[PDB]
Amino acid sequence: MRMSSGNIGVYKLDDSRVDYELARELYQNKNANYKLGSSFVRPIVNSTTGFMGVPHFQIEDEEAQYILDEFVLDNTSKMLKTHTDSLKQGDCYIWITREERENPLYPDKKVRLIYNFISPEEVKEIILDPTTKEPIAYILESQNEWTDLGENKRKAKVKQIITAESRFVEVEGDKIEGLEEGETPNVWGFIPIIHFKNEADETLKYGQSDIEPIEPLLKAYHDVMLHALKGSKMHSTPKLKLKLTDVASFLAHNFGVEDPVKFAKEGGKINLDGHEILFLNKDEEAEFVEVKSAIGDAKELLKLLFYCIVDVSETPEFIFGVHTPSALASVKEQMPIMVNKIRRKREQFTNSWQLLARMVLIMSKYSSYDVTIGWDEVNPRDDKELAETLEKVCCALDKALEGGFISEESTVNFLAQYIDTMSNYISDDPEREGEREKIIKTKML
Amino acid sequence: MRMSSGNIGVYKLDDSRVDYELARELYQNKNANYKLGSSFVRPIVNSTTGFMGVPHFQIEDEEAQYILDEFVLDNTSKMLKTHTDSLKQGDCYIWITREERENPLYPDKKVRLIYNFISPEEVKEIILDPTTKEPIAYILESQNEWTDLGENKRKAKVKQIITAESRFVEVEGDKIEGLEEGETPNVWGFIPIIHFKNEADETLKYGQSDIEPIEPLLKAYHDVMLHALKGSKMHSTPKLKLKLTDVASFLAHNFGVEDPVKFAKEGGKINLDGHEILFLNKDEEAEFVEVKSAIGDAKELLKLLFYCIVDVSETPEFIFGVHTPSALASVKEQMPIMVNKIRRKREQFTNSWQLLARMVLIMSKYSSYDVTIGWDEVNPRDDKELAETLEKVCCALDKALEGGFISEESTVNFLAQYIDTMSNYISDDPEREGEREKIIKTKML
Amino acid sequence: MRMSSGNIGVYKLDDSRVDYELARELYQNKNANYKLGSSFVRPIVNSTTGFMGVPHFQIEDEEAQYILDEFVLDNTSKMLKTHTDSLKQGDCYIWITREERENPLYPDKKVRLIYNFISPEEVKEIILDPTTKEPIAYILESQNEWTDLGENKRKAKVKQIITAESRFVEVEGDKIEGLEEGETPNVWGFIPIIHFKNEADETLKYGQSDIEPIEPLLKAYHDVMLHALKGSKMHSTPKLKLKLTDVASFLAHNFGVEDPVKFAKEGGKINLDGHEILFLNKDEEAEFVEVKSAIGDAKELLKLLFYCIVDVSETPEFIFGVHTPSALASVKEQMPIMVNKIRRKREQFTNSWQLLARMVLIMSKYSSYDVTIGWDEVNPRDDKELAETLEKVCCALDKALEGGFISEESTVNFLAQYIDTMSNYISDDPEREGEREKIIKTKML
């Protein structure tokens, strides 16, 4: 709606968070208030995170490219889990750490960069620069309950302040060997934590889960489903109604129920087999008390709520094709809608991935530290069609020779793109296959 | 839902575990509280585990590649079983052991690496490093009840601590010949156990079964089915109602029931056939007491619960095409949904497979220990189309010769991928055929 | 479905068995409690065992390959029956024995390896190594009732211990000429028995039948069908109702039933031809007492149970296309589902087949004893398409000659694959046709 120019309050940033425990419960269908309704959460989040894939780090420096290739080779699955965590929870925090420990399971890697997840509950507070809004300190806090290599239980409340100039850590409880209390300097002068913020908003400090828009619809769907289930349980089975001359005599004679009041008080049950025949007198009557529909219009309301859920999440209908088998007729026809959604969604994380690649390069000189994020194919391209258009361009070239030698400039780029498309396996997330194939080719020659 | 920045509890890792016995019972349709509902568990789990196949270990060192080829040749089926176990139970544990025993059944393989399964119930406790969160000890425990080669029954409670520096085993009860009590050194400085964690989450210590999201839906489906079945058994067959002048005399004359009270008390049955004729008085009446529908709306509710189950598991609709025969048509059209699900699912295990391959290589010097995991094709490629695009690329090359000799770098990689696509049989799990074809070629030359 | 870390009992191996007699009765539709329900057992097991075919033993040693070719030539049908038995019963035991007896029916084969089945009931107990869980003794027991070549009946209770170091046999009854009583040495120091274990689980000593998951559904289907059939038999035929002024006089005049009580006591029947005309007085009435539906909703419940059975067994819908004729229209479209199921199923037996081939090779020096298990085509390939892509390979090669002489390496492997896929007849189980074609080529030259 509209409003006058005045009569509007001062802008204030929101520090509210996503209630990550509830989001995880909805994702796993565990919350009792959403069990019948939260069935839609998993397909939405998982289809969205599967179709967007993982970033493909691209940089023009050969050494930086090699470092990023090694990093993705190590942590492509962790990147995909970062995507699905950000979608489910709204916030996901990635901590890059460098460990020089020597252990015999990794004799080939003296120094390793670790892709550590900080659970969003651990981040008690983020201290932002009031002007530039970038973080200047992360207040992590966790309750570590663990067991010693002996038989002793252990507990410790660890809070650690992570800042660009140093990191402080103090534990309130049992000793932890790997963490040294007190302040220790931070080797690089930046915070090595990356905040992944799904559905980031300029008026919000933290991200938003993809479940948040649909959550009231899930609640309504659960309520309608539960009401329908209870109504059917109570009334779907018709009730036999016997209008008897003497109810007590009939019960005593036919079921041995001598005291029906006590029989009802104790919840007694009359056993029936189905193949019964009724011998009544003239005045008595037997009839079934039956409902035309114990559910009423709950089916239509659930269909409307399903439509609203699909609209809000913007899920293409083939994801929910069991509801609407028409969508399964042509997935390729609907795939542009998925491409549009994934295009919109990938931009919410590419800046974070550029920051992560920049920090990885710094934490391990290079002519450039900027990275461009490539991506997996949402709608896979036909390699045969690519070769067809390649040969068509080639035969178009080498004719009307006044055009100059930019034919080489065009064809080298086309060949590079063709190799990228061909070597990247459609059904395998990331581009580890292409990197390892290049490495094997370099080794074998 | 949202919440304020404050008023949030401290993060704590969850040590809860999947009820493995219940998970197996649901998988095998054995639990009486889920028999009519747990019919969906098997298609979900088995379609997911069969479409993802088994990993293809790739490494640039030829010795490491040969070792991994031998390992997959020996233990490819156990890896598919590991996938199935991780999906069904949430947790699967693989113990790699090296055995030098000489037995006549293996005259050649003097030394063997054994792919042993630790049942998830055996793992009494996992001791984690409080900082790095990696396991530093595994507390295994099992009750071994067995028969001696004579006639004697044997029972022994064995618990063994498996640590990176040594392994300790103590057995209470009868002697076990193959296990030596007390501590013995660990020849390898790392724990040789691999923890396969399905649906791993940063806030969880153990994996989640694929049955957990659908379990309440399975329970509701079972309840609705059982209620419908009981209602139909009670009321589907219509009941003949006779309004007689005198019931007792009618029963005595027509069925010889001289004492109807005792007849009902003992549960006597009146034998009848379909062909009958009723001779009644003018005042008497005979009628059938019948239900329009003994089930009511349970069919619609079961349809809704089936939709919820299919949505939660994200199973493509052709898996349950008997419910929806439209889904059976155009399975290739629905394959991208399966491809997406398998893409997302394979990343929960690839890191564990990298660890397993690394440990196998260390257990059996190599220039590298990093293994890249390939995979079976979900939507198999057409060999003829690969040949066509190979020809198109080839004729595109050898023209506009200013491009240089990088055409070798593209065509050799394409030929490698091409031979990989051919030698790997689509219908056969893993790549045993591709490895042994090369081995037979090397032998025969 | 979750549980806390503690409050879990110790792991114990389960030695329950599959009730093989009941499984065979269900397979043969012989159990009276499953006759109307067990109709689905045969198509499930037989489709699964027929589409998976038999193993193709591949080894790189020419002599070992020849030995395995002879073995499969002898025992391909027994191998397929082993698959069927493992699926039906859960357990199948194969005993490889070597006999040097001279008989005139086999003058060409002085020494033969016999593929003997041990019925799973014969195996009283399997003694396992408590640590490695490999069997160390098989306790076989059978009641041999037979006839002498004369007129005498014979009965003997034979139990034999089969161990790696020796085999013991004792007979409690009549003499058996072929079994020398007492202990005898084992020529090879391994047990010559192979245990085929369908649906093997780490927590189960024995295998599981494919009937076990569906058995409660079969029981429910039988119960619903039997209730429906009895209800229809009782009530489908409408009952003629005559409201008469005097029933006894009517019966006496129209049917000669002078004493209706004695007529009803003896179960007398009134003969009717269908073409009757009723002459009544004004006060009397005649009407048919008829049911709208004697079955009620049993049809819908049976459809639901059929869907559950198809889901549990994971049978592709074209196997039960009589229920759903839509499936039959697109069998080729559904073949990927069958391929997935069969690919998953084959891995449960391939280790046993590798062990069997290894034992066969040992029981008859070789450079290698490891065998790779090939398989029949589930979705058969088109030979013309294979030749087409071969031509595409050939024209792609011999161009851009810097690639080297690995064209030979690729093309020889593809020619071998083409010969394999061409000579192996699709409609004939196994590869005996290709083996004898090669043998005839060698003989005739």
Author numbering:
A (entry chain K), B (entry chain L), C (entry chain A): 19 to 382, 389 to 469
Give excerpts from the publication.
Here, we reveal the extended and contracted atomic structures of an intact contractile-tailed phage (φCD508) that binds to and penetrates the protective S-layer of the Gram-positive human pathogen Clostridioides difficile. The virion can be divided into five distinct regions: the head, neck, tail, baseplate, and needle. Structures of purified φCD508 virions in both extended and contracted conformations were determined by single-particle EM of frozen-hydrated samples; the resolution ranged from 2.6 to 4.0 Å for the extended phage, and 2.9 to 4.2 Å for the contracted form.
At the base of the capsid sits a unique opening, centered on what would be a fivefold symmetry axis in a complete icosahedron; it is made up of 12 copies of portal protein gp45, forming an opening through which DNA is ejected from the capsid. Thus, there is a 5–12-fold symmetry mismatch between the capsid and the portal. (J) CryoEM density of C1 portal/capsid assembly showing the symmetry mismatch between the pentamer capsid vertex and the dodecameric portal. DNA density shown in yellow does not form interactions with any portal proteins.
